[PDB]
Amino acid sequence: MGPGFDFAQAIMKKNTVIARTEKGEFTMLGVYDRVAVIPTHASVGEIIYINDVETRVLDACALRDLTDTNLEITIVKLDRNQKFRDIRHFLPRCEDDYNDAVLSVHTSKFPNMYIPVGQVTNYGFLNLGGTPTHRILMYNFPTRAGQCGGVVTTTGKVIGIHVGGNGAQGFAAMLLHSYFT
Numbered sequence: 123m124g125p126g127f128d129f130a131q132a133i134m135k136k137n138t139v140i141a142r143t144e145k146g147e148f149t150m151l152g153v154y155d156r157v158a159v160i161p162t163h164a165s166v167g168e169i170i171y172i173n174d175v176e177t178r179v180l181d182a183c184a185l186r187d188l189t190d191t192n193l194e195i196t197i198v199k200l201d202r203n204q205k206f207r208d209i210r211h212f213l214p215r216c217e218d219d220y221n222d223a224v225l226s227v228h229t230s231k232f233p234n235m236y237i238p239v240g241q242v243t244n245y246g247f248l249n250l251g252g253t254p255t256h257r258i259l260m261y262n263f264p265t266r267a268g269q270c271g272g273v274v275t276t277t278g279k280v281i282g283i284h285v286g287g288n289g290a291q292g293f294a295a296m297l298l299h300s301y302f303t
């Protein structure tokens with residue numbers, strides 16, 4: 123509809139795949155080369171399905187901060203015959219708050235879905251499904267099961283991936299440039 127949705131659509135059409143684990147179907151953001159991200163609660167194993175194709179996982183790392191606190195981001199290197207467009211230059215360098223964000227989801231359940239979530243707060247600490255979690259972003263949108271892994275963008279920045287909600291608010295894990303140097 124406008125320049126928020128334009129940037130969101132470019133990221134979705136080139137830099138997302140559908141990932142399936144034993145824990146469900148997720149939006150998965152490709153960042154550069156064969157490196158992608160997914161919520162840690164997807165429980166990535168040795169094999170994952172990518173767009174319904176059996177794919178070996180070359181490496182997987184569940185990120186934690188230097189206090190040994192969950193960040194809810196798993197970085198995955200996929201045994202795929204093609205690289206992602208490099209979008210590292212759209213990642214923020216620091217923790218921040220944002221205006222006018224879009225949450226974009228692409229799965230079998232929610233194809234080509236874009237949600238204007240509005241203002242995004244640096245919320246910080248969240249007890250997410252019982253697990254203490256840091257670097258959480260919050261938006262005041264009533265997000266639903268099936269949105270996990272959804273990409274949060276502003277015009278020109280890829281800022282986070284959706285990891286949960288409480289029925290009134292949605293929560294994303296921050297993406298930072300330093301995760302992918």
Ligand SMILES: O=C(O)c1ccsc1
Nearest residue numbers: 128131132133135136
């Ligand atoms: O390839 C691209 O840059 C693209 C795809 C959809 S909108 C922009």
